[PDB]
Amino acid sequence: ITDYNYKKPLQILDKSKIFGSNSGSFVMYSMKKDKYYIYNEKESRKRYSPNSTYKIYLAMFGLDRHIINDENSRMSWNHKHYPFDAWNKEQDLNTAMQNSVNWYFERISDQIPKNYTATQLKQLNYGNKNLGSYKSYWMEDSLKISNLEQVIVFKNMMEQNNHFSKKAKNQLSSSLLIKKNEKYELYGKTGTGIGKYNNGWFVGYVITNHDKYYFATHLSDGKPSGKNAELISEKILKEMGV
Ligand SMILES: *C(=O)[C@@H](NC(=O)Cc1ccccc1)[C@@H]1N[C@@H](C(=O)O)C(C)(C)S1
Numbered sequence: 191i192t193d194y195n196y197k198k199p200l201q202i203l204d205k206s207k208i209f210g211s212n213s214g215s216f217v218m219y220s221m222k223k224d225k226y227y228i229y230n231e232k233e234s235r236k237r238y239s240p241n242s243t244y245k246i247y248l249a250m251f252g253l254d255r256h257i258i259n260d261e262n263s264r265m266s267w268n269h270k271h272y273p274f275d276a277w278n279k280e281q282d283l284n285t286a287m288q289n290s291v292n293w294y295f296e297r298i299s300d301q302i303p304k305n306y307t308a309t310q311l312k313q314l315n316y317g318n319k320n321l322g323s324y325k326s327y328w329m330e331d332s333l334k335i336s337n338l339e340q341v342i343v344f345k346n347m348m349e350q351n352n353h354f355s356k357k358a359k360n361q362l363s364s365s366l367l368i369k370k371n372e373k374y375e376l377y378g379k380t381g382t383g384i385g386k387y388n389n390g391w392f393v394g395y396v397i398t399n400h401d402k403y404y405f406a407t408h409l410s411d412g413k414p415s416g417k418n419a420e421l422i423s424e425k426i427l428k429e430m431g432v
């Protein structure tokens with residue numbers, strides 16, 4: 191009822207054929223040129239739950255409040271059998287991000303009061319800002335963000351001379367690196383919502399030798415999967431600027 195699509199106004203694109211039988215949007219931002227590039231402006235402004243992309247923010251708050259740190263991003267397994275075998279071991283930040291280990295981020299969340307989080311979501315302009323009963327509010331629930339916001343918000347949280355330390359930003363960055371060769375480094379995080387897949391995400395950024403870009407892809411129908419959002423994301427960055 192209070193849910194609304196992203197209002198704040200700020201070049202656009204046609205990637206309709208890469209998306210094919212999936213539907214959703216793409217957003218990109220050039221540091222050097224200070225401009226946005228968007229495929230599907232209207233869909234890009236619709237608010238969806240960020241699901242596992244919110245781990246970015248959970249990690250950042252975890253490092254800020256010290257809940258986890260340089261040396262002790264650790265946290266033990268509760269010896270509960272989850273389907274993913276990568277989830278069934280000791281974790282650190284890199285491991286839990288790479289492998290999107292829900293229990294690790296949920297334990298960070300456990301230790302964070304609604305008022306630090308609400309304050310943070312307000313400084314950051316994180317969508318909705320709608321926390322719930324404040325449980326797993328990021329996992330298909332009250333909290334919601336648009337694809338466009340994902341990009342502005344992430345770019346602003348990392349680039350603004352702001353209260354998060356360069357060091358926690360850098361540990362986060364490490365946790366999110368996905369590909370690297372000579373030309374580029376690609377960073378980001380997959381999100382997959384569910385008995386059905388209906389909300390797929392891939393949010394991140396790429397550093398080349400020349401420029402630095404933040405981008406995000408959402409998926410709502412077709413095969414809205416974190417996996418497919420990453421593929422689409424990769425085909426767009428390739429077919430555009432190496
Ligand atoms: C984050 O998106 C996680 N998704 C789920 O656990 C599914 C789910 C269940 C209940 C509520 C909301 C979402 C992990 N992220 C993805 C991903 O990285 O694409 C996985 C499917 C790997 S699990």
